[PDB]
């Protein structure tokens, strides 16, 4: 099988740091660590992991011994060289067969090289090992698969890493893993014979996308290239006045739910840290927006509704709910773009001898539509009487009392509730978060945050005729084209980042490993400046020696030189250009395809050509 996997692997042809021992630097641990060493019999014992390596955060130890290992997860203090001096809050010990197996054929020449890979994905500490006989005279290039030994759930935080030593009276090869896509070829017996990276070379990427290890001659479309933005600019409007949010949450007479106080918030910089401040929160269930991601949006209008209700009524208030308050006093709309707030107020809505200043309605002729106020004192009709006057049987007063006293249950304690309404639609926003206004840069792929319109592209000057009330631009296909600058009142167009498509032109791998790269439909002076700035999404870095660049009509070809001769088309590129593998001593050349042998007929007034012979040709058709 040619199974393809995406996981943490050591990149092919990557940087591996070679050490020497004759003090013990602490190599950072991130996304796993590749360890390889070659020793005669034994010069390395174990490893240490954890953060800060002190008696304040759980640590780990993998020290091997003559016959077993000593894996544990503990709270070591230090040794500075008996490898620890503290095991106070320490559990999860483990002993088993040693990870080190060394054999010799009656000679020390068989310097077995040992490779280790550790990683800490979702805890579950994984260790793989493999002992090869290839001596380690030079770090071998032959493939050797790594098989797991143990899999134990430390479930701890690891950022730092160390290595122990041994005693005596060329090793330490350390590599780092990264998330890469690998294509692995399996033997008929289940072993691994060869594998190829999928983010190293263009030929490797074609070999990955057409999963195989033999790539036939031709042109293959593998992926697309995108110019990653360099700088992120955010341009919020020209206002720094903080909201009266403090006034909204520091009122003294939050009205009853039957007659809910309604305020409006506009012309603001809305920072909700001051909101978090004056609130021992009890309920921050937010539906329209995420409370964590709330300071990076702009609302055209914000409405602050405030009223005091009971403990269960907090759970009552939500989009699409039921109850006496959710139906007759406050019905939040089903498509509610906003969120409510609730915290205990048992000191201001309570007093000795009781308090009943508050009110609520249980008797309404019908349900309350979202955001409707029904402040009125009309006796609810029962039976068929026209009942008027005093309250009594069959004739009920609509609104009853939220009599609050300082000694109730939690379900009956006087909770304070303030609900917020937002409108996140394409409109001129007036209320924004506390995000700072960075500078503006033109003619450069940037992440813009213009007045809440998040996106990426290249912005520049324009000669539009934006009318005074206009804010945005668009096209017949309804995509944002231009945004007026809130702090400059100018017009800036928006461009795609660089979207294109990369096609790799190669002969068969059984012939050569050389390839050429085609960036489809892009003036590739753009990629040349982009590739120098290292902002191109493709990481497979093809060479650019100046002689291999040719701006075709279909993009430009990199890696193949242009010859002005004409040959039959071998690998069709596009727009009358074909590339082929020809001897020089070998390279890839692009040329204008020849339609055929240039021939001229000899037509004349009285000249005729008559064949004096003939041939019989047998063709085939499939």
């Amino acid at each position: 099988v040619l199974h393809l996997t995406q996981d943490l692997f050591l990149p092919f042809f990557s940087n591996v740091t070679w050490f020497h021992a004759i003090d013990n630097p602490v190599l950072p641990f991130n996304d796993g660590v590749y360890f390889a060493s070659t020793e005669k019999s034994n010069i390395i014992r174990g490893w240490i992991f954890g953060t800060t390596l002190d008696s304040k955060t759980q640590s780990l130890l993998i020290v091997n011994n003559a016959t077993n290992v000593f894996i544990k997860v503990c709270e070591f203090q230090f040794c500075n060289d008996g490898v620890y001096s503290s095991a106070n809050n320490c559990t999860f010990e483990y002993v088993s067969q040693p990870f080190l197996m060394d054999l010799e054929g009656k000679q020390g020449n068989f310097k077995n090289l040992r490779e280790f890979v550790f990683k800490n994905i979702d805890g579950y500490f994984k260790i793989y090992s493999k002992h090869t006989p290839i001596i380690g005279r030079d770090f071998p290039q032959g493939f050797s698969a790594l098989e797991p030994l143990v899999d134990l759930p430390i479930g701890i935080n690891i950022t730092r890493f160390q290595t122990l030593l041994a005693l005596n009276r060329a090793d330490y090869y350390v590599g780092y893993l990264q998330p890469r896509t690998f294509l692995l070829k399996y033997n008929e017996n289940g072993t691994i014979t060869d594998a190829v990276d999928c983010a190293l070379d263009p030929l490797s990427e074609t070999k990955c996308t057409l999963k195989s290890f033999t790539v036939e001659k031709g042109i293959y479309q593998t992926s697309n290239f995108r110019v990653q933005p360099t700088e992120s600019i955010v341009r919020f409007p020209n206002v720094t006045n903080l909201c009266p949010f403090h006034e909204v949450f520091n009122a003294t007479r939050f009205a009853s739910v039957y007659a809910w106080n309604r305020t409006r918030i506009s012309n603001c910089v809305a920072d909700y840290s001051v909101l978090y401040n004056f609130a021992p929160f009890f309920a921050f269930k937010c539906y329209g927006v995420s409370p964590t991601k709330l300071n990076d949006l702009c609302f055209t209008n914000v409405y602050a509704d405030s009223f005091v209700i009971k403990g269960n009524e907090v759970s009552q208030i939500a989009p699409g709910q039921t109850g006496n308050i959710a139906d007759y006093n406050y019905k939040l709309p089903d498509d509610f773009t906003g969120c409510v707030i609730a915290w205990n107020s048992n000191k201001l809505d309570s007093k000795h001898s009781g308090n009943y200043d508050y009110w609520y309605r249980l008797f309404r002729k019908s349900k309350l539509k979202p955001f409707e106020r029904d402040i009125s004192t009309e006796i609810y009709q029962a039976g068929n009487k026209p009942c008027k006057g005093v309250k009594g049987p069959n004739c009920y007063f609509p609104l009853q009392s939220y009599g609050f006293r300082p000694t109730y249950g939690v379900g009956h304690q006087p909770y304070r509730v303030v609900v917020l309404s937002f409108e996140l639609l394409h409109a001129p926003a007036t209320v924004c978060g506390p995000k700072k206004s960075t500078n503006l840069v033109k003619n450069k792929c940037v992440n813009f945050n213009f007045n809440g319109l998040t996106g990426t592209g290249v912005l520049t000057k324009s000669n539009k005729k934006f009318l005074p009330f206009q804010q945005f631009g668009r096209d017949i296909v309804d995509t944002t084209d231009a945004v007026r600058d809130p702090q400059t009142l100018e017009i800036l167009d928006i461009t795609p980042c660089s979207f294109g498509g990369v096609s790799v032109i190669t002969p068969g791998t059984n012939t050569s490993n050389q390839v050429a790269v085609l960036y489809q439909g892009v003036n590739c002076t753009e990629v040349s400046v982009a590739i120098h700035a290292d902002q191109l999404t493709p990481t497979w870095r093809v060479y650019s020696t100046g002689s291999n660049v040719f701006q075709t009509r279909a993009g430009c070809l990199i890696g193949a030189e242009y010859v002005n001769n004409s040959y039959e088309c071998d690998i069709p590129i596009g727009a009358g250009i074909c590339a082929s593998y020809q001897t020089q001593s070998q390279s890839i050349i692009a040329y204008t395809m020849s339609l055929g042998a240039e021939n001229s007929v000899a037509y004349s007034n009285n000249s005729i050509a008559i064949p004096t012979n003939f041939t019989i040709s047998v063709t085939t058709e499939i």
Binding site: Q221, S290, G521, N523
Partner: protein
Amino acid sequence: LPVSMTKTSVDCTMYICGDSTECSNLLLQYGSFCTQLKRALTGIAVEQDKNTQEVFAQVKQIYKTPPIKYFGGFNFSQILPDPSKPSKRSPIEDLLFNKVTLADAGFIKQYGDCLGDIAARDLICAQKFNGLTVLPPLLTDEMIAQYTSALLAGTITSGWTFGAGPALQIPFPMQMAYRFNGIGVTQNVLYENQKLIANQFNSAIGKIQDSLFSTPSALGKLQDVVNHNAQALNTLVKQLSSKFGAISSVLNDILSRLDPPEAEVQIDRLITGRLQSLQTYVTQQLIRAAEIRASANLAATKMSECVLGQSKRVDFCGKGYHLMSFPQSAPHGVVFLH
């Protein structure tokens, strides 16, 4: 006769999830639903290139017309290439190019002026904004005209012999006599009314240009193909502004407004809408490409029979007894002069 259509290379990832890692991860849960789409579109593009090759690349040796043009009184200046024009195309071939307007050339490298569009960006920049690109044809509209010129200069100086074996020269009056003899009228008729038939041929060739000039759209088939492709692309683009039952139609908006655990539902709705739209587009393009392939096969057969010889099948190569045919290249098609 249409011969080919615009070649598209829709990007599933960019079209459905504009530069959003969460959306890409959610889309990866659908399996290879878009790898099939990319393979189908690549097959369509290759099939279009093959159609053009089959229709035009019928001769292996490119012939050239004699330096003088005296074909026994027959006038061919209207169909022969014009050296003065930089494009090296026939006067009748110029009208076909000027009467067909392509919405998206594709071979423009238009990136760099979308920022400079000044006014509201057009259909092409709008498509580039959402990963909707169009590849250029392998055979340029200049060398296709060269193939046409070679094929037409082979049938006025060598008769039909250059379509079978080696090109054998023969005077045009004698070739006309042979074509006459092929339909049951003896050659003495032509050798006695050569001047009159030359005058009739010149009149017909002259008045076909004005007939193509004054008609509103006689090339309605090629424009129909171009309009169908452009309208399918426009409808594909217009589906990006539909909510599909989600909170909002903007991925960057719903991503920056809600936390991922709740935004996953809206992202799934957007995925299941856009994937269905893209699949509908791909299926319609497959059907249209099959129809275009059938038409291109018919055009190749018509070329090989009417142009490279005389056809005895009635009403195949024009109405009446067929004599010859001259090819002319048109945007995404071929034009025959029976």
